[PDB]
Scaffold this active site. Sequence first.
Site, PDB file in Angstrom:
ATOM      1  N   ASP A  97      17.865 -11.376   1.357  1.00  0.00           N
ATOM      2  CA  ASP A  97      16.837 -10.788   2.246  1.00  0.00           C
ATOM      3  C   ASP A  97      15.388 -11.245   1.993  1.00  0.00           C
ATOM      4  O   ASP A  97      14.472 -10.421   1.891  1.00  0.00           O
ATOM      5  CB  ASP A  97      16.918  -9.255   2.259  1.00  0.00           C
ATOM      6  CG  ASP A  97      16.212  -8.652   3.451  1.00  0.00           C
ATOM      7  OD1 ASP A  97      15.907  -7.435   3.451  1.00  0.00           O
ATOM      8  OD2 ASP A  97      15.941  -9.425   4.402  1.00  0.00           O
ATOM      9  N   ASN A 115       8.834  -8.851   2.202  1.00  0.00           N
ATOM     10  CA  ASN A 115       9.487  -8.467   0.960  1.00  0.00           C
ATOM     11  C   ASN A 115       8.912  -9.216  -0.263  1.00  0.00           C
ATOM     12  O   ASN A 115       9.575  -9.302  -1.301  1.00  0.00           O
ATOM     13  CB  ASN A 115      10.977  -8.800   1.047  1.00  0.00           C
ATOM     14  CG  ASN A 115      11.748  -7.844   1.883  1.00  0.00           C
ATOM     15  OD1 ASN A 115      11.347  -6.702   2.115  1.00  0.00           O
ATOM     16  ND2 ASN A 115      12.923  -8.297   2.327  1.00  0.00           N
TER      17      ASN A 115
HETATM   18  C1  LIG Z   1      -3.265  -2.658   0.276  1.00  0.00           C
HETATM   19  N1  LIG Z   1      -2.207  -2.490  -0.721  1.00  0.00           N
HETATM   20  C2  LIG Z   1      -1.102  -1.755  -0.519  1.00  0.00           C
HETATM   21  O1  LIG Z   1      -0.857  -1.108   0.507  1.00  0.00           O
HETATM   22  C3  LIG Z   1      -0.199  -1.750  -1.597  1.00  0.00           C
HETATM   23  C4  LIG Z   1       0.986  -1.002  -1.649  1.00  0.00           C
HETATM   24  C5  LIG Z   1       1.916  -1.255  -2.687  1.00  0.00           C
HETATM   25  C6  LIG Z   1       1.574  -1.720  -3.955  1.00  0.00           C
HETATM   26  N2  LIG Z   1       2.470  -2.009  -4.892  1.00  0.00           N
HETATM   27  C7  LIG Z   1       3.774  -1.888  -4.672  1.00  0.00           C
HETATM   28  C8  LIG Z   1       4.677  -2.179  -5.697  1.00  0.00           C
HETATM   29  C9  LIG Z   1       6.039  -2.070  -5.442  1.00  0.00           C
HETATM   30  C10 LIG Z   1       6.490  -1.624  -4.203  1.00  0.00           C
HETATM   31  O2  LIG Z   1       7.842  -1.502  -4.047  1.00  0.00           O
HETATM   32  C11 LIG Z   1       8.516  -0.935  -2.819  1.00  0.00           C
HETATM   33  C12 LIG Z   1       9.875  -0.290  -3.216  1.00  0.00           C
HETATM   34  C13 LIG Z   1       8.597  -2.104  -1.802  1.00  0.00           C
HETATM   35  C14 LIG Z   1       8.203  -1.872  -0.499  1.00  0.00           C
HETATM   36 CL1  LIG Z   1       7.675  -0.319  -0.046  1.00  0.00          CL
HETATM   37  C15 LIG Z   1       8.226  -2.854   0.479  1.00  0.00           C
HETATM   38  C16 LIG Z   1       8.654  -4.135   0.176  1.00  0.00           C
HETATM   39  C17 LIG Z   1       9.040  -4.422  -1.126  1.00  0.00           C
HETATM   40  F1  LIG Z   1       9.437  -5.683  -1.409  1.00  0.00           F
HETATM   41  C18 LIG Z   1       9.009  -3.420  -2.120  1.00  0.00           C
HETATM   42 CL2  LIG Z   1       9.539  -3.891  -3.697  1.00  0.00          CL
HETATM   43  C19 LIG Z   1       5.567  -1.308  -3.171  1.00  0.00           C
HETATM   44  C20 LIG Z   1       4.207  -1.448  -3.417  1.00  0.00           C
HETATM   45  C21 LIG Z   1       3.289  -1.162  -2.428  1.00  0.00           C
END
Ligand SMILES: CNC(=O)/C=C/c1cnc2ccc(O[C@H](C)c3c(Cl)ccc(F)c3Cl)cc2c1
Length: 285
Positions: free
Chosen positions: A139, A144
Site C-alpha cells: 500500500d 502513507n
Molecule cells: C501538519 N502536521 C500534521 O498534521 C501531522 C500529523 C501527524 C504527525 N505525526 C504522525 C505520526 C504517525 C502517524 O501515524 C498514523 C497511524 C498514520 C496516519 Cl493517521 C496516516 C498515514 C500514515 F502512514 C500513518 Cl502511519 C500520524 C501522524 C500524523
Amino acid sequence: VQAVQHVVIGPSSLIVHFNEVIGRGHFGCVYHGTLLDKKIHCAVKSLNRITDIGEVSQFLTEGIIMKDFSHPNVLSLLGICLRSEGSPLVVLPYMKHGDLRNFIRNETHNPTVKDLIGFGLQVAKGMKFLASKKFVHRDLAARNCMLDEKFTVKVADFGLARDMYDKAKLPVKWMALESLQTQKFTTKSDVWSFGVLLWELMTRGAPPYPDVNTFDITVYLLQGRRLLQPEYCPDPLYEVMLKCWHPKAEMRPSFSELVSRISAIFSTFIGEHYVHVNATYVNVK
Ligand SMILES: CNC(=O)/C=C/c1cnc2ccc(O[C@H](C)c3c(Cl)ccc(F)c3Cl)cc2c1
Ligand SMILES: [Cl-]
C-alpha cells in the site's frame, strides 16, 4: 516477558490526548500523545480489537519486527502500550509536517523540481531498505509517507499502523496489473505503486487517473494506457515512471536501480524550477 521488554511502554509513561484526533481509521483513531523519560511528542493509535491472549502476543511480534526496521526513511515504532484497561496503544514518533500528499497539496508551500525528486529519492531508499528485509508494503502512496521536522520522508502505514486513512477497500489506482488480476503482491508490485507515488509528487498530489472508474482500472491499463507526463516532470523521471509500470513484473527496475537512477536525476536540479499546481487536477477527489 524479558526478551519483549525493549518494545513495551508502561501505561504510567504515556499521556494520550483523547480530545485531539489526528486521523480516523477502520481499526481505531490516532491522537497526539506525550511520552515520558522528559516530554516527547508522539502519535498514539488506539486499536479496538484487543482481548485475545494470542493477538496481544501477536501484536507483540510485529512490535519486535517494526523495532527492527529502523532506517531514516522508514517510520519506526517508539513502543506499544499494554493496558489492563481495554485496549493497547501503538506509540509512533510524531511527524511535524504530517503526510507527504497533504504537504505537497498545501498551496502555501513552494517546492521545486529538486525537492519533489528529493522526496521521491527518499522513498526509494526506505523501500530499498524494506525490500532487502524481504518485506512487501502492498500500500505505497504519498498519503502513507510521512515528513518530519528536518524534511526526512518516512515510509509508513505498515505493521501495527496499517490502515486505510483516506476519506473501495483496495487502493486500485496504485496497484500493479498482476495484483489486480491475481490479488498477489511482491516487491515488483511495490515498484509499480512507487511509480504512481512519483507521479503524485510531480503533480503535487493530484489524484491519479481522475477521469477513470476505480472498477474499470484493469481494462484501462490493458488497453495501452498509463498516467500522462506531469507538466514539471523531467523526461528521464517520466521514463522511470514508465519502467515502474512495465506490464511484466520481472522487467521492472528494482529499488536499488531506482535509487541509483533517481540520484542521477536529482544531482542535476538545483532549486531553480518552482512547481505549481496543474489546472486539470486541482480540486479533485
Ligand atoms: C501538519 N502536521 C500534521 O498534521 C501531522 C500529523 C501527524 C504527525 N505525526 C504522525 C505520526 C504517525 C502517524 O501515524 C498514523 C497511524 C498514520 C496516519 Cl493517521 C496516516 C498515514 C500514515 F502512514 C500513518 Cl502511519 C500520524 C501522524 C500524523
Ligand atoms: Cl529545481
